[PDB]
Design a protein around this ligand. Structure first.
Ligand SMILES: CCCC(CCC)[C@H](N)P(=O)(O)O
Ligand SMILES: [Co+2]
Ligand SMILES: [Co+2]
Ligand SMILES: [K+]
Length: 304
């Protein structure tokens, strides 16, 4: 394998972290290949679930807890801390909240969160590499509680970063907020990518195409599929009761991605940097509730 950038995996990994048996587990947790019976059963569906009041409560809770855990991880970002150390803290933080770390054994994913440094687009595996001054790092948190998953991520600065890093992360955040702002009943899911690409491109960045936002509730990933690029073919129209994510990945260079031989780590083919933010959103009668919103600050971590 020829790496696309300077980053390399830092192995061996610590042995897999166990979750106490009293934490309720999603169906794939114990599947030998980490496959989900219920996602298999609904694979290929276009029908978007209208959540019940009890579902909405379940989603509010799990998403609030996911936010808390992401916030635990943000508090750790600094030069010298390994992504593994971050994952350990995130794993304990999930357990402490009576939640299962959703990524753990999802299609055999080895860790409890995704850490994506620099040219990693998404799904980086926490490992022995210490964070370095000037890195950007996304931490992606997904938690599972009482039958519900809650999904969010933020990109962070590691010490002082260059102007190019500032601009990429800022623009990425602005792309997310511009898309969220459009969400309300009657809007086509395919329109969000127009908004995202328009802003990214205006700033000289490209929009990853291979990974999309998604419905989320009882399944981790389900309808609708939500592309972040312009003129996509997404099916569906927003209605009050819909729950989905928007999670744009934006890049310094080209949009093209490839996967490391670990089967997960998605990197820019050119080796240039990529940033992402993600919220889980509930469509309301009037607009949208940001279920994974920070409660104790109006701003994401990179802005302070
Ligand atoms: C590799 C795992 C993928 C998933 C989380 C897994 C439950 C991510 N949080 P995503 O949907 O890519 O935001
Ligand atoms: Co996520
Ligand atoms: Co997601
Ligand atoms: K990245």
């Amino acid at each position: 394998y020829r790496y696309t950038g300077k980053l390399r995996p830092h192995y061996p990994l610590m042995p897999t972290r166990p979750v106490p048996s009293y934490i309720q587990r999603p169906d794939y947790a114990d599947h030998p290949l980490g496959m989900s019976e219920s996602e298999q059963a609904l694979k290929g569906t276009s029908q978007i679930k209208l959540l019940s009041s009890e579902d909405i409560e379940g989603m509010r809770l799990v998403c609030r807890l996911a936010r808390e855990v992401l916030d635990v991880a943000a508090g750790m970002i600094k030069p010298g801390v390994t992504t593994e150390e971050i994952d350990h803290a995130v794993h304990l933080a999930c357990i402490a909240r009576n939640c299962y770390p959703s990524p753990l054994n999802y299609y055999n994913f080895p860790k409890s969160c995704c850490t994506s440094v620099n040219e990693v687009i998404c799904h980086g595996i926490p490992d022995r590499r210490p964070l370095q001054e000037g890195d950007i790092v996304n931490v992606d948190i997904t938690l599972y509680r009482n039958g519900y998953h809650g999904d969010l991520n933020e990109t962070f600065f590691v010490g002082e970063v260059d102007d190019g890093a500032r601009k990429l992360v800022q623009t990425t955040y602005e792309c997310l907020m511009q898309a969220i702002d459009a969400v309300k009943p009657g809007v086509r899911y395919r329109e969000l990518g127009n908004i995202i690409q328009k802003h990214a491109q205006a700033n000289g960045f490209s929009v990853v195409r291979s990974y999309c936002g998604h419905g989320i509730h009882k399944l981790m990933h389900t309808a609708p599929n939500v592309p972040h690029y312009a003129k996509n073919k997404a099916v569906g129209v927003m209605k009050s009761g819909h729950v989905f994510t928007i999670e744009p990945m934006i890049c310094e260079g080209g949009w093209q991605d490839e996967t490391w031989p670990d089967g997960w780590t998605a990197v820019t083919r050119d080796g240039k940097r990529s940033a992402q933010f993600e919220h889980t959103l509930l469509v309301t009668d009037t607009g949208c509730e940001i279920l994974t919103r920070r409660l104790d600050s109006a701003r994401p971590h990179f802005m302070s």
